[PDB]
Design a protein around this ligand. Sequence first.
Ligand SMILES: CC(=O)N[C@H]1[C@@H](OP(=O)(O)OP(=O)(O)OC[C@H]2O[C@@H](n3ccc(=O)[nH]c3=O)[C@H](O)[C@@H]2O)O[C@H](CO)[C@@H](O)[C@@H]1O
Ligand SMILES: CC(=O)N[C@H]1[C@@H](OP(=O)(O)OP(=O)(O)OC[C@H]2O[C@@H](n3ccc(=O)[nH]c3=O)[C@H](O)[C@@H]2O)O[C@H](CO)[C@@H](O)[C@@H]1O
Ligand SMILES: O=c1ccn([C@@H]2O[C@H](COP(=O)(O)OP(=O)(O)O)[C@@H](O)[C@H]2O)c(=O)[nH]1
Ligand SMILES: O=c1ccn([C@@H]2O[C@H](COP(=O)(O)OP(=O)(O)O)[C@@H](O)[C@H]2O)c(=O)[nH]1
Lengths: 362, 362
Amino acid sequence: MKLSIILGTRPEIIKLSPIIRALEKTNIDWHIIHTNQHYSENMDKIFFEELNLPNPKYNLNIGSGTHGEQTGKMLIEIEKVLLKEKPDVVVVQGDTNTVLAGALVASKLKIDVAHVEAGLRSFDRNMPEEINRVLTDHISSYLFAPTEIAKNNLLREGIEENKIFVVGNTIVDATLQNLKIAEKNENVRAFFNSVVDDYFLLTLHRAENVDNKERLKNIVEGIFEIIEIYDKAIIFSIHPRTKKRLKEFNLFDKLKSNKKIKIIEPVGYLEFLMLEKNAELILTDSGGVQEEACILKVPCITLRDNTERPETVEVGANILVGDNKEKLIKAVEIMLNKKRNWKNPFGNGKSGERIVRILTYG
Amino acid sequence: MKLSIILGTRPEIIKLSPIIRALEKTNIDWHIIHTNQHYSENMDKIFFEELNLPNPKYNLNIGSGTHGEQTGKMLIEIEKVLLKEKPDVVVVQGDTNTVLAGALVASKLKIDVAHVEAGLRSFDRNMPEEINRVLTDHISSYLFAPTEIAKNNLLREGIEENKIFVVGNTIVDATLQNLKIAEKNENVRAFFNSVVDDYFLLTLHRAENVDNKERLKNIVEGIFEIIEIYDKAIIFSIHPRTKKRLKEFNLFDKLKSNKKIKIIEPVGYLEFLMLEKNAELILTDSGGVQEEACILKVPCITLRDNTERPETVEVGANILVGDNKEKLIKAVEIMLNKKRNWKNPFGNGKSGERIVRILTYG
Ligand SMILES: CC(=O)N[C@H]1[C@@H](OP(=O)(O)OP(=O)(O)OC[C@H]2O[C@@H](n3ccc(=O)[nH]c3=O)[C@H](O)[C@@H]2O)O[C@H](CO)[C@@H](O)[C@@H]1O
Ligand SMILES: CC(=O)N[C@H]1[C@@H](OP(=O)(O)OP(=O)(O)OC[C@H]2O[C@@H](n3ccc(=O)[nH]c3=O)[C@H](O)[C@@H]2O)O[C@H](CO)[C@@H](O)[C@@H]1O
Ligand SMILES: O=c1ccn([C@@H]2O[C@H](COP(=O)(O)OP(=O)(O)O)[C@@H](O)[C@H]2O)c(=O)[nH]1
Ligand SMILES: O=c1ccn([C@@H]2O[C@H](COP(=O)(O)OP(=O)(O)O)[C@@H](O)[C@H]2O)c(=O)[nH]1
């Protein structure tokens, strides 16, 4: 009858864009509820613009806070909307606090929850993302798993097979809908040329990496060392959480002092795809960037002790180095010489359309 | 270092009482956070009094509301307390919204959660209690399962065996600590004699039974019919949710008009144990009452389509009849002739002490 998409953050907007593209080709009555978990223009507005997405019908203006504060406000405010609008399906993507809050509200209202990117596991169930995803999976009526590994994760937790659909990851659709747009846009090319030929691309924002000063210090030390050993320039797109933490721990001024590191504010998706595509290698703790690196055939080094997309490591596209600078140094050598051929485990880029078809039929 | 018990409702207070008794015999620094989900004196204060429990250190005064509103306020307010007090273990009992909120706050703060009465499943994961219990189990560090069935439920959902302890149900301790107290107290005996020799005892409050008018009507019809067929008096302890719904659906005046039904306001635990012990049979949709009926060797008829304590049906103590008056009529005949011998699957009444020992050692 009626579908509500609930989203809050940069990666959700990007990964829901192919679902929105598919919904636009149907007669389905649907709208977006934005929690405004993310609110800075370069974390939010820019994606609605570049991805040609409609304005949310509801903006809850929750923003930042501690987990209980933020999630609690979300339960209160999302419920007010769902009690009024009464959709019969709620769609949430991924593993943010917005996802959990949307699913929890819907489940108690007896509204079917469709979870896009279901079944991913790092088995670091101490991570807030792992908590969010596990809990959401257990109250979902449709579990859209990106891979057979994810499906098997769900089966091992006793979830009924008829709820699970292996549809690929919508990030393939997004990277495939937008890379050629980025490549053929003169403004995007001009941005790229203003910022950049040999470089490593870095993003870092996991709570467990940037909220912990000695882990953050270790990673910064590691980056300084990569630069000296390999004589490589680094382009660092800096998440606002990470900027705040770097300043809190007095590490920010040391990065800006390093003339081989170019620090840039968060950029739009088209701009970022260009930075990824052209990087000699990608260093990250982002979930989506691990996937994009794999899709774009650019070697990835993941600054985490584990990942919830192990298929990237399994196919040879990615290597985990955590906090450890020696592991990081060795990984750079390995990946610098790595042939950029590997399988893509995440599907053929029509996941959004498949998800909408499944929800249409039920 | 420090333990926080978080509770909100009548059944939690009763089932946590043996844990409190055990904690009092130790040097552990512990206190109670009360969400005040329940607040009426006969749902709350009376249990703190009769069970000789200390005043909560914190009262959050959340009270009633819809699920998102109530749970959301709980996340906000519980987090404020836990950020200040910083316990290293949080104990929650059962499956109420208070349990889920406490566990969710603690999990994101990286505080170990101990779940008392873990692993129970009705597999009606559309029930709010089933949602609460499943989600809580998946973020718990200690899972205190009452039976091997419950342990197996947890294992089937992929939970690590080293987190699971089959300790029995603390309701055995409570029924065993308090029945002899009730029996030897003159005021309790006087209450019993004022209210009551042959009767059936009824309680009914599941959301799915009392919020749904035609289900509630069906059950009331069923009770009227039992009375006529078996010529039996009914004592009905009426939960405040149920009173509100009966009046909303214009069924309350019909019950009060039935001279074979004695409607009583909710009573204290000592008083209720006496009513249970002396009933010819018990009719209920309560979780705790199903257990107590089994423990007290009084036949039980459960007005639900399923139960999360199937061991009571398995040992012959209980039968499910749902909404169906014909099933109810047949069940009364069966249970009226049932020999009051069966196994007790819920342990030997020292679960509270075992739980505290486990938390002490880790
Ligand atoms: C618990 C949770 O849901 N975490 C998600 C959140 O992390 P993220 O780190 O963004 O978590 P928050 O939404 O809590 O924001 C953290 C901090 O970043 C700053 N801030 C955030 C948003 C903004 O528009 N402007 C701003 O300045 C604030 O200082 C804020 O306190 O989004 C990430 C995407 O980028 C996801 O990978 C994370 O899974
Ligand atoms: C979702 C949830 O956590 N449900 C639990 C809650 O149900 P319960 O039915 O009590 O659920 P609520 O706490 O939401 O209260 C429901 C209604 O009962 C009335 N009311 C409630 C409490 C009170 O002290 N006074 C009062 O009058 C109010 O009208 C209120 O709106 O407690 C029961 C114990 O009895 C448990 O079996 C349920 O699992
Ligand atoms: O300056 C940037 C950095 C990242 N991204 C995109 O952000 C997404 C990933 O989001 P994020 O790293 O914030 O979160 P995570 O995937 O770890 O949840 C990917 O699709 C990136 O292409 C972007 O558009 N601009
Ligand atoms: O008038 C009453 C009715 C019940 N109880 C006790 O309430 C507990 C069960 O709580 P409830 O039925 O409200 O909730 P549930 O067990 O279904 O969560 C049992 O221990 C009962 O003995 C009580 O003390 N007085």
